[PDB]
Every structure is written in C-alpha cells, then in structure tokens.
Design a protein around this motif. Structure first.
Motif, PDB file in Angstrom:
ATOM      1  N   UNK A 277       0.805  -1.212   0.000  1.00  0.00           N
ATOM      2  CA  UNK A 277       0.000   0.000   0.000  1.00  0.00           C
ATOM      3  C   UNK A 277       0.844   1.270   0.000  1.00  0.00           C
ATOM      4  N   UNK A 278       2.163   1.137  -0.160  1.00  0.00           N
ATOM      5  CA  UNK A 278       3.088   2.248  -0.333  1.00  0.00           C
ATOM      6  C   UNK A 278       4.124   1.749  -1.343  1.00  0.00           C
ATOM      7  N   UNK A 279       3.674   1.556  -2.582  1.00  0.00           N
ATOM      8  CA  UNK A 279       4.303   0.625  -3.507  1.00  0.00           C
ATOM      9  C   UNK A 279       5.127   1.284  -4.604  1.00  0.00           C
ATOM     10  N   UNK A 280       5.143   2.611  -4.686  1.00  0.00           N
ATOM     11  CA  UNK A 280       5.825   3.294  -5.760  1.00  0.00           C
ATOM     12  C   UNK A 280       7.153   3.897  -5.341  1.00  0.00           C
ATOM     13  N   UNK A 281       8.026   4.091  -6.332  1.00  0.00           N
ATOM     14  CA  UNK A 281       9.208   4.915  -6.120  1.00  0.00           C
ATOM     15  C   UNK A 281       8.801   6.344  -5.782  1.00  0.00           C
ATOM     16  N   UNK A 282       7.866   6.901  -6.548  1.00  0.00           N
ATOM     17  CA  UNK A 282       7.305   8.203  -6.215  1.00  0.00           C
ATOM     18  C   UNK A 282       6.362   8.073  -5.027  1.00  0.00           C
ATOM     19  N   UNK A 283       6.561   8.922  -4.021  1.00  0.00           N
ATOM     20  CA  UNK A 283       5.654   8.926  -2.884  1.00  0.00           C
ATOM     21  C   UNK A 283       4.225   9.262  -3.288  1.00  0.00           C
ATOM     22  N   UNK A 284       4.019   9.897  -4.445  1.00  0.00           N
ATOM     23  CA  UNK A 284       2.685  10.237  -4.924  1.00  0.00           C
ATOM     24  C   UNK A 284       2.162   9.248  -5.962  1.00  0.00           C
TER      25      UNK A 284
ATOM     26  N   UNK B 115      -1.669   8.712  -6.573  1.00  0.00           N
ATOM     27  CA  UNK B 115      -2.390   9.808  -5.938  1.00  0.00           C
ATOM     28  C   UNK B 115      -2.817  10.883  -6.931  1.00  0.00           C
TER      29      UNK B 115
ATOM     30  N   UNK C 206       1.010  17.652   0.220  1.00  0.00           N
ATOM     31  CA  UNK C 206       0.305  16.623  -0.542  1.00  0.00           C
ATOM     32  C   UNK C 206       0.886  16.457  -1.942  1.00  0.00           C
TER      33      UNK C 206
ATOM     34  N   UNK D 164       5.352  15.563  -0.848  1.00  0.00           N
ATOM     35  CA  UNK D 164       5.682  14.334  -0.146  1.00  0.00           C
ATOM     36  C   UNK D 164       4.530  13.335  -0.103  1.00  0.00           C
ATOM     37  N   UNK D 165       3.318  13.754  -0.500  1.00  0.00           N
ATOM     38  CA  UNK D 165       2.119  12.948  -0.759  1.00  0.00           C
ATOM     39  C   UNK D 165       1.082  13.054   0.352  1.00  0.00           C
TER      40      UNK D 165
ATOM     41  N   UNK E 284      -0.597  10.600   1.718  1.00  0.00           N
ATOM     42  CA  UNK E 284      -0.489   9.571   2.743  1.00  0.00           C
ATOM     43  C   UNK E 284       0.654   9.855   3.707  1.00  0.00           C
ATOM     44  N   UNK E 285       1.723  10.506   3.245  1.00  0.00           N
ATOM     45  CA  UNK E 285       2.758  10.923   4.184  1.00  0.00           C
ATOM     46  C   UNK E 285       2.198  11.965   5.145  1.00  0.00           C
TER      47      UNK E 285
ATOM     48  N   UNK F  95      10.356  13.965  -3.590  1.00  0.00           N
ATOM     49  CA  UNK F  95       9.149  13.324  -4.102  1.00  0.00           C
ATOM     50  C   UNK F  95       9.416  11.858  -4.412  1.00  0.00           C
ATOM     51  N   UNK F  96      10.598  11.553  -4.937  1.00  0.00           N
ATOM     52  CA  UNK F  96      11.032  10.172  -5.080  1.00  0.00           C
ATOM     53  C   UNK F  96      11.656   9.685  -3.780  1.00  0.00           C
ATOM     54  N   UNK F  97      11.335   8.443  -3.410  1.00  0.00           N
ATOM     55  CA  UNK F  97      11.867   7.881  -2.174  1.00  0.00           C
ATOM     56  C   UNK F  97      13.377   7.690  -2.241  1.00  0.00           C
TER      57      UNK F  97
END
Ligand code: 3WL
Ligand code: ZN
Ligand code: ZN
Lengths: 336, 344
Positions: free
Chosen positions: A204-211, A214, B169, B172-173, B175-176, B216-218
């Motif tokens: 449920x947090x599955x992407x390289x991009x945090x978004x 979304x 949002x 960092x998104x 959900x973060x 934005x990328x982990x």
C-alpha cells in the motif's frame, strides 16, 4: 485482451462494497475474543496485526492475526533459515517444555479460550482456529509472537527494496518488530518467521514516487497485477480442486513472485496503467519461470526456497505451468 | 557564481567533522535524563530526536526533553492559534503538583525542571545558565553550549489550528501527510504578549523528518541520478542570515530574525516546487537564488505563515517592525548583487 483484464478487475471491486458488511461481523467477534484472551495471564499482551483476504475471490473469508509480545532467544531449527525454537532470557512459563516454548501447549490453551468464548458460531497449525460466523462468513485466526529485537540473521540479505522503495525505507521497516507463527517443520514445536505487516506496508506504499497513484499522471498498475495474479491462481485451484495438484500453491507464492517482479522493475513508469496487459503478462511470465526453474525465494529469507522439491513436487509445478500457459494463450477463459 | 556557494558548503562540512563535541553532549544529556526519570513528575522524560539552530556555531547544541502528558485538553489563548493553556481530563496525575487552578503552570514545572537540572549537574565539570523556551543553558567544558527545552508530548489529534497546514500533498504525498499527523505534537513553555502560563505548539520532530526525507522520489539523494540540492539551499540560507546577523550585531536591526524564519520560508519553497527535477544539483546557483528571492518576497509583503499553523504570520508587524524587514531586505539584496561577499 487487456480490456478483459479490466472486466475482471471491475467485478473484483464491486464485490468489495458487497462485503464491507462482512468485515463488521468479523470485527465484533474478534474484539470479544481479545477481551477474554486478555483476561488470561498468558495472553495478557494480545492484540491485532495488519481483516485481510488471503483468497481474493472469497470475499467472505477473512484472515486475522492475533499478536502477542514476548525478550526472546531464538534457535534455528536444522538450518531451515525460517523455522526456530524460541528459548528465553514470565507469563508463558505454562508452556515451557524444557527450555523451549511449546507451540502445541500454547496453541492448545489458545484454542480452548476461543472455543469457550465462541459459545456466545463454530470452530473447525498455521491457521490455529477457523470460525464460521452465521453460515456465510469464515475467519481464520493465527497466533503470532511479537519480538521488537533486531531481525534474524537469515533476513540480512532479503527485502531488496533499496533501488525500488529506497534504503532509507528498508532501514525503517527493519527497525519494526518481526513475528513468529507456530508452524510444523518437516517437528511440532517450531515457529516460522512472519512479515505480513511489512508485506502490507510495501503493498500500500508501492511506488518509487511517494505520490504514486495519488494523481492521474502517476496511476500505476502494480496492485491490479497482483489481484489478477491471485485471482487466476484461485480460479485454477477451484476448477481442479478435486484433482488436488494445485492444493499446495497459495496466494503467498503469487504474492512473493510479485514482490520479486517489483524488484526487477523498480521504476513507476514500467507500471503505467496504459500497459496493464503487458505488465500482467510479464507478471505471469515470471511466475512461470519460478515454476519451471523451481526457484521462488522467500522475499525476506532468500535462502528459503518456497518452490523447493522438498515442498512442492515437480508434477504439481508442471501441471500449474501447463494450465497457466493454456490460459495465457487463450485470453484467460478461466476468468469467466 | 554557484561555485562560491560550493566553497561555503565545503567549509560548513569541514567544521561538522571536527562530531566529538556531540559525543560529550550525549554523555551529559544521558546522565541528566537518568536523574529526571527518578522524579515522580518527570518519569516519562526522554529525547525527541544533535540540533544546530545556528549552523555557523557547531559548538552550540539544542536539545528537547519530551515528557508525555496523556489525555489533555487544550484551550487556545486569545485566538493566537499557537499558544494554549493545558488542562487535563482526569485527576492520579503526577503533574497535579503543578496546577494553578485547572491549568498546568508553565512556570511551576519550569522551576522544578530547572532545579533538578542545576542540582544534578553539580555532580560532574559543567555549569547551568539561565535563559523560557530553552529552560537552561549547559556550558560543557571549554566552549560547548547546550540549550535545553522541555516539551509536553500529546498523542491526541493535532489542534484545529493546524488543520490546513503541512501542505505537502503534492510534494511528499497525501499519505505521508496523514501518517505524520498521526504522530504526536509538542508544547513548549513560551510566554505570549505577557501572559505567563501559555504553551506553544512544536513540530520540530516533523520538521526533521521532512528535511531528511525530502524528495518526491523515495530514492532522492540516494544515487547520482537523483542528487538534489534542497538541504544545501537551506544550509546556505541559514548561513547567509547568521553571517548578516553577525556583521550587523551592533545595529539591533536583525535581532528578531532566526533560523526558524529561514527554515519556514524554505518549507514553503519546497511546497512551491514539489518536483525533484526542480532541485537538480547542477542548478544549485539558481535554486539558491530562488530561495533567497522567496524569503525576500516574504520580507517585503510581511507574510511568513508558520508551515504548520497557516494563520500564524511569523512576519507580523506585531513581531518584527517594518524597518527591520526593509533593513534585512536591502542587505540581502546587496549580497546577492555582489556574489554574497559575506560568505568570504
Ligand atoms: O519550533 C519552533 C516553533 C516556533 C513557532 C513560532 C511561532 C508560532 C508557532 C511556532 O518558533 C521557533 C523559533 C525558534 O527560534 C526555534 O528554534 C524553533 O524551533 C521554533
Ligand atoms: Zn501506484
Ligand atoms: Zn534529495
């Protein structure tokens, strides 16, 4: 035939709203069981992990993990890399057999407290107990020990998420507790490592991009591919249930192969929703490669081969191989 | 002219290695926490997270001793959005010894907090100075200073004043943001213009997570193709201010500007530019100019929202007069036009 895949995803989703009522009936039974289990001295620290669906096409079938925190000492069973005896450095003196915590005795008292409480709805050792609420909703309850110590050495070179979800996330997850479920070892007092909580996090947090997923620009198809993978195995297991060849295969094998496919293709752009068809086809093709070569490493315990000859016979693998290959060559008729 | 910026970052990096002082601090800090946990009122004492409010003074450290206060209700003071009185929903309470009426006395706990500190330190050699946002200042050995702040930890939902803050949002998104808002928030003793028993909201722990997990990328900054300059831009911003504050130490014009103002402005810039490709290391010069420009825009318009409390303007004219903003504005504008000679 990608549109057919989404026709499948369409139906798998509509049944979810038709079963959110079933999850409520489960939460009620579970909360009562935990209240009385907490009254007992040995299960005083009981709680929940993660409703979940090991079988996606069986929405009335739930899986619950009751967690029990323990400061342990662990002894690997016969180099299995995944099964252990749990010795100690206590409320579980009851279940000591020598210096080993007995799964059998701890499982026993576990069942009896539940079998007594359920009389207020029947009970049927990975899945310790299985309940039937009313006559449609079933739930499998698994007991698990929780250890907040560093993970076992057999996990050192697993969870290869660094190039996908980042090394910083790998260190974060590996600081979380790990779990142990009582499981027979080809022995009856062994415990097997569980990481269901970590599996849910990276699902449920599955992407390289945090978004990822979304916004419209970053809709990927990772989740859709795994559901389609689980759904095809479950459909194939039901069409051949009275032949038993596919009985040893579970959604966990499909889930593990999917995590490996995520490692191989770590970029979000390799999972573009426009490419659902080829993304799923590549997911099937990797699973097939695991079948033919008889190699499917536990995603957390790399030296533990889920597909080893000692666990699944070659004839079972070749049967699932032929069936899946026939399905892929014919636009998956088993999906209807 | 981005290379002079790199020269600055080279300098700042060299002084951080010459980390030993941090080892001395952790020793005194751990002895101090041991003695406070022996008191019934400070049993839940602990650390939140080294912290350098002044990047150019590595010898000066800042520490937060957190203490969990379960089941509190907050009452806002004078619609300030940031300062509250703290009351409890029960009484049983170890800090009941510090109530004045139904409110927790900031000054009464601060007095006992300060008394236990000065008492235990005398058994070691370091002295304790008076400062009350940091309650004490520890002077360790030759030149190490430690500012100690105590904060209450509440695991309840964040105060309503923060409802539309932390707008990460698109960066960092969502959900973060949801995850970070499930973490606790903090309250430090701070007078409000003054009312003597208020507590101010602290999110210093959220600020650290966002700076050290900023992409934005982990995998931001974990490989060569994703190296960014977000952190370097903030270093250069804090350093520019601290230098300009030192040069004008005599005019008392820059006295009310702090690294927190720089930090807050930086977070708003991160919101404005959420994509990692807008922070490429090859564009350190342009990215630092953009950061300087935005802080200047805040100075001229007299608007710097608290990144978590959007209706609290750090640059309100009640806090910093217009003259000070225009003085700092002209100085920075001069620095930028001359390739920042205050870096030399
Ligand atoms: O955490 C901080 C929060 C606030 C603040 C100011 C106005 C309204 C709400 C919060 O000011 C600060 C000032 C500082 O000099 C500093 O080092 C800080 O860590 C903070
Ligand atoms: Zn996605
Ligand atoms: Zn970065």
């Amino acid at each position: 035939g990608a549109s057919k895949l989404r026709a499948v995803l369409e139906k798998l989703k509509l049944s979810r709203d038709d079963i959110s009522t079933a999850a409520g009936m489960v939460k009620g039974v579970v909360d009562h069981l935990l209240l009385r289990l907490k009254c007992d001295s040995a299960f005083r620290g009981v709680g929940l992990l993660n409703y979940e669906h090991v079988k996606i096409s069986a929405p009335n079938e739930f899986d619950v993990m009751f967690k029990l925190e323990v400061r342990i000492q662990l002894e690997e069973y016969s180099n299995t890399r995944a099964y252990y005896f749990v010795k100690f450095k206590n409320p579980l003196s009851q279940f000591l057999e020598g210096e080993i915590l007995s799964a059998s005795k701890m499982l026993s008292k576990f069942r009896k407290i539940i079998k007594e409480e359920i009389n207020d709805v029947i009970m049927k050792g990975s899945p310790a107990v299985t309940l039937l609420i009313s006559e449609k909703i079933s739930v499998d309850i698994t007991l698990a020990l929780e250890s907040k110590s560093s993970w076992p050495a057999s996990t050192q070179e697993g969870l290869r998420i660094q190039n996908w979800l980042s090394a910083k996330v790998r260190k974060q997850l590996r600081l979380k507790p790990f779990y142990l479920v009582p499981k027979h070892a080809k022995q009856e007092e062994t415990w097997r490592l569980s990481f269901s909580h970590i599996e849910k996090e990276i699902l449920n947090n599955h992407g390289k991009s945090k978004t990822c997923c979304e916004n419209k620009e970053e809709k990927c198809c990772r989740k859709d591919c795994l559901k389609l993978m689980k759904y095809l195995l479950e459909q194939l297991k039901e069409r051949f249930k009275d032949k038993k060849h596919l009985d040893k295969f579970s959604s966990y094998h499909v889930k593990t192969a999917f995590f490996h496919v995520c490692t191989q293709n770590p970029q979000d752009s390799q999972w573009d929703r426009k490419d659902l068809g080829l993304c799923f086809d590549n997911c099937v093709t990797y699973f097939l490669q695991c079948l033919r070569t008889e190699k499917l490493e536990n995603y957390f315990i790399p030296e533990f081969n889920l597909f080893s000859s000692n666990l699944i016979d070659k004839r079972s693998k070749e049967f699932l191989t032929k069936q899946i290959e026939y399905e892929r060559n014919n636009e998956f008729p088993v999906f209807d």
